[PDB]
Design a protein around this ligand. Structure first.
Ligand code: 017
Lengths: 99, 99
């Protein structure tokens, strides 16, 4: 499909058997999701943007479905104000910018 | 053009008669540029990102050309980690997400 940018590009995703709303974000290197209790091991990480850095938990090879498009890759989990789908997964669903 | 997301979607912009590199950022409502000298009046504003809130200078009705496409809109100037082009200007150049 095609998504215009008049409003925030929020879409439904499926992760760990849960449906959430997330932002398709070309400015995010990696996917970061609001606090959630995923199982498995993880690695500490810090990611930075406007305002500074937050601490997150890095989970690897996590399956996520974005608009019915399946993907698998790194998912960060932490106190982000919003669920963010980053380039690491946007590439996997064939997402491009067009103008 | 069609821009894939394996690398950061960095493009050259022209603002205040000066060339700069900036990130096309569909997750940003607004356009935020690193510290620079812009002519005309400005108002102090606050904006929040993943790590909290920063103080910025708001310039309205600024001419800015993004990858050969002209836009006239609001540009925030402050301590952002990188020049980001947000939806307020992405809409003006006709940018959409496609997958
Ligand atoms: C600043 C960018 C280089 C990086 N950011 C993605 C960006 O899209 C954020 C994503 C974002 C969106 C909402 C809230 C927090 C973060 N947007 C943002 O900061 O925009 C601000 C300017 O316009 C306003 O609209 C949104 C917030 C303001 S980030 O959220 O900090 C980020 C950094 C690293 C990763 N792996 C994932 C995300």
């Amino acid at each position: 499909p095609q998504i215009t940018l008049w409003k925030r590009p929020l879409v439904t995703i499926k992760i760990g058997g849960q449906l959430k709303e997330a932002l398709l974000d070309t400015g995010a290197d990696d996917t970061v999701l609001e606090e959630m209790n995923l199982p498995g091991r993880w690695k500490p990480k810090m990611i930075g943007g406007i305002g500074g850095f937050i601490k997150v938990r890095q989970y690897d090879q996590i399956l996520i479905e974005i608009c019915g498009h399946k993907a698998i890759g790194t998912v960060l989990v932490g106190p982000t104000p919003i669920n963010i789908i980053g380039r690491n997964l946007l590439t996997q669903i064939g997402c491009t910018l067009n103008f």
